[PDB]
Structure 1
Amino acid sequence: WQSARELLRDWPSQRHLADRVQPLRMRLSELEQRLNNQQNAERLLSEFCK
């Protein structure tokens, strides 16, 4: 019974958070491009400053 109540408590959270996947995917892509630009700028800075 306790496990069942815990499971049915999880189910609300489970669906609500699983709905969040796709918006987070684009956020991850954007953040990846941000990191890529960060490395590009850092590299270019290093080569010039040498």
Structure 2
Amino acid sequence: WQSARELLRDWPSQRHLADRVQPLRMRLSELEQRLNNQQNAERLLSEFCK
């Protein structure tokens, strides 16, 4: 009984947050592109610094 109640507590949250995978997917694509830009900027900055 207690286990089942816990599962039925979690499962709606699982269902609630499953939909976020795709918004997360584009989110991480954009975020990683941004970090790529940040790394490029950092590298170029250091490159000129000298």
Per the normalisation by structure 1, the TM-score is 0.92
Unaligned segments of structure 2, at least 5 residues = none
Q: Provide, for residues 1-45 of structure 1, a one-character-per-residue CA deviation record: whole Å limited to 9, x for no partner.
A: 000111111111110111110000100010101100011011111
Between the aligned partners of 2:47 and 2:19, the Cα distance in structure 1 is 44
RMSD of equivalent CA atoms: 0.7
DSSP-derived class of the 2:38 partner? helix
DSSP-derived class of the 1:15 partner? helix
Aligned to 1:25: 25
**Which portions of structure 1, spanning 4 or more consecutive aligned residues, are displaced by more than 4 angstroms?**
none
DSSP-derived class of the 2:23 partner? helix
Unaligned segments of structure 1, at least 5 residues = none
Identity of aligned residues (%): 100
For these two proteins, the number of residue pairs brought into alignment is: 50
Between the aligned partners of 1:15 and 1:2, the Cα distance in structure 2 is 20
DSSP-derived class of the 1:30 partner? helix
